[PDB]
From a paper:
The photoreceptor sensory rhodopsin II from N. pharaonis (NpSRII) in complex with its cognate transducer NpHtrII serves as a model system for studying transmembrane signal transfer. This complex displays a 2:2 stoichiometry where two transducers are flanked by two receptors. The long rod-shaped cytoplasmic domain consists of two HAMP domains (present in Histidine kinases, Adenyl cyclases, Methyl-accepting proteins and Phosphatases23), which are followed by a methylation domain4 involved in the adaptation processes and a signaling domain which harbors the CheW/CheA binding site5. HAMP subunits contain two amphiphilic helices (AS1 and AS2) joined by a non-helical connector.
In this state, the HAMP domain adopts a compact conformation which has been correlated with the active state of the complex. This conformational state is made possible by a high flexibility of the linker, especially in the region of Gly83-Gly84 amino acid repeat. Indeed, replacing a small glycine by a considerably larger phenylalanine would limit the ability of the HAMP domain to rotate relative to the membrane part of the transducer and thus forbids the ground state. In line with this reasoning, our data on the crystal structure of the NpSRII/NpHtrII1–135-G83F mutant demonstrate different crystal packing. Although the crystallization conditions were the same as for the wild type “U”-shaped complex in the P64 space group, in this case the space group is P21212 giving the “V”-shape structure similar to those observed before. The previously published X-Ray diffraction data on the NpSRII/NpHtrII complex only showed electron densities for the transmembrane domain of the transducer but not for its adjacent HAMP domain. These crystals of the wild type NpSRII in complex with the shortened NpHtrII (NpHtrII1–157 and NpHtrII1–114) belonging to the space group P21212 revealed an overall “V”-shaped topology with an opening to the cytosplasmic side. In the previously determined structure of the complex (space group P21212) quaternary structure has a “V”-shape and there was no possibility of interaction between the NpHtrII’s HAMP1 domain and NpSRII.
Author numbering:
A (entry chain D), B (entry chain B): 23 to 83
C (entry chain A): 3 to 225
D (entry chain C): 3 to 217
Write the structure that this text describes.
Amino acid sequence: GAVFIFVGALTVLFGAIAYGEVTAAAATGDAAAVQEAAVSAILGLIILLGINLGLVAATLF
Amino acid sequence: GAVFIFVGALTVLFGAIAYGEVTAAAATGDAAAVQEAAVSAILGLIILLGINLGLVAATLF
Amino acid sequence: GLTTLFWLGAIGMLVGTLAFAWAGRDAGSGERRYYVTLVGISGIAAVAYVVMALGVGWVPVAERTVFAPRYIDWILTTPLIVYFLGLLAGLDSREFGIVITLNTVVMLAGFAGAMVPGIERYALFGMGAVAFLGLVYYLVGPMTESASQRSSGIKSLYVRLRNLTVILWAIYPFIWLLGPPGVALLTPTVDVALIVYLDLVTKVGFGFIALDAAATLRAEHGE
Amino acid sequence: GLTTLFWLGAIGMLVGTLAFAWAGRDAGSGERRYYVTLVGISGIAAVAYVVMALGVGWVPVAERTVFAPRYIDWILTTPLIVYFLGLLAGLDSREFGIVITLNTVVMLAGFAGAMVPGIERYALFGMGAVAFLGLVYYLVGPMTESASQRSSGIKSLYVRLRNLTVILWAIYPFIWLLGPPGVALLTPTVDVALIVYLDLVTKVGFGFIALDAAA
Ligand SMILES: *C/C=C(C)/C=C/C=C(C)/C=C/C1=C(C)CCCC1(C)C
Ligand SMILES: *C/C=C(C)/C=C/C=C(C)/C=C/C1=C(C)CCCC1(C)C
Ligand SMILES: CCCCCCCCO[C@@H]1O[C@H](CO)[C@@H](O)[C@H](O)[C@H]1O
Ligand SMILES: CCCCCCCCO[C@@H]1O[C@H](CO)[C@@H](O)[C@H](O)[C@H]1O
């Protein structure tokens, strides 16, 4: 019940951190640099979704 | 049990789709194009979490 | 690829449709329209996805693209889902008319908003959003009370499907707002992928949950 | 910002430490060890994050940065977590020695691997990964059976902490593999952010679960 809000809020926070690296990379004008930041963000979020699901499974079950 | 495997696997599939757009944009050389694909990927993955958690909440509680 | 995603949607809906048709082949008098309804829900969705996969109905609006068969699908299938929930809840004609009306306003609003440029599209969004809140109220209030006047098995199934419906449908307007019709931060591909996933769960997943409970309902009154 | 994330980790650990210290102020003879252990788990982690936040212990290793205090933290606090679990399970010295040994191999391997260039780092990773599976075996096998022989309250708390521990600890090697020590697909900031989150749950989150159960 309260885990969801926590999980949801941390995800938008990590999302903001990810978007931050991407735009910083974009300010360079180097496409490959943005790609690097982007795959990091993508893999980071997949892992983050794993932590949250794991935290949900460990706490609510 | 079954849901977490389904949810997990679908997360990697959407990840691959997101990564595909990012690399497709990077092949244009346009850093703004990559940033554009990246924010879509980030926001998409966040929405995906909401769906997964929603599904878990719906079918296991 | 967009067309690939549409094909995946079409195949998923088709599998659901056949499974629901097969499962209901021996259904008694009291269960038959529930199976028929499920077949209709995923069958129409199957048509919409095949049509889009064939590259039909892709309407150019300004610089974004609006997939007309998607909203047509929605306008026609969502009231059938509401109808299914209403049968479980045991609604009368009056009560059905209320919730179907609200549902229709939601889907008309979203379609119209997708076709309109500028500030107006948010006004149309607002209409659907408020209508959706009204629909949720009926689903969780009066209709839940109505379902409580039936067997524990029926109420149980109703609650399960209601929770699935309320939770997941609430995700759709965020995809609209962030996607092409809204601020366009989600690419068409990502928009389509998320909706395929949602469409499959809210219709096919919805159906298999109902299917899984059928035997319990049958044993509840002597069989 | 790395130092900001490090600071956030420090603050989180500190709040946890204080909370656990306060909770066990009136603890009896049968509970004192548990609170003291929790204090040590989050307290040491607090020191490591502060040190990193002040920019100390950042080691350059072949085009990547290795955060030494992080691994030293792991080497020292994870056996305390295992110790806590072992107390619940009711282990004796011999059994404790087994699980602490396996745990130590995991942390040493990750640390050594992070500081070694080339394919050797994966050999070191493998050593850690295998020892981790050994540890998981004990937690879900013998230690679970040992915990089952105690009261249902203790058994339930053990299982709850076991599950949190096994599930979330298993995520660390994937971050190691995909992060800077491995294929370096995760930027240092993303790697650090993920680890801060995991550390806080596996120590502070761990503690609050235990506090709730003792209540
Ligand atoms: C099987 C397809 C389904 C269940 C589609 C459901 C779509 C909705 C619940 C859409 C809701 C919307 C709002 C609430 C706001 C305006 C935008 C809409 C139409 C997307
Ligand atoms: C509070 C900090 C904690 C609970 C850290 C736990 C770290 C692990 C479980 C690390 C495991 C690793 C492997 C299993 C493989 C080799 C790489 C390691 C050390 C990261
Ligand atoms: C596809 C899953 C089948 C769900 C069938 C639910 C119907 C169980 O209940 C039915 O309700 C009918 C009213 O609609 C009545 O005729 C009977 O009370 C009963 O047969
Ligand atoms: C916040 C951490 C609280 C967890 C403490 C749980 C321990 C309760 O367990 C106790 O262990 C005692 C020590 O041997 C024994 O006296 C008893 O077996 C038991 O009452």
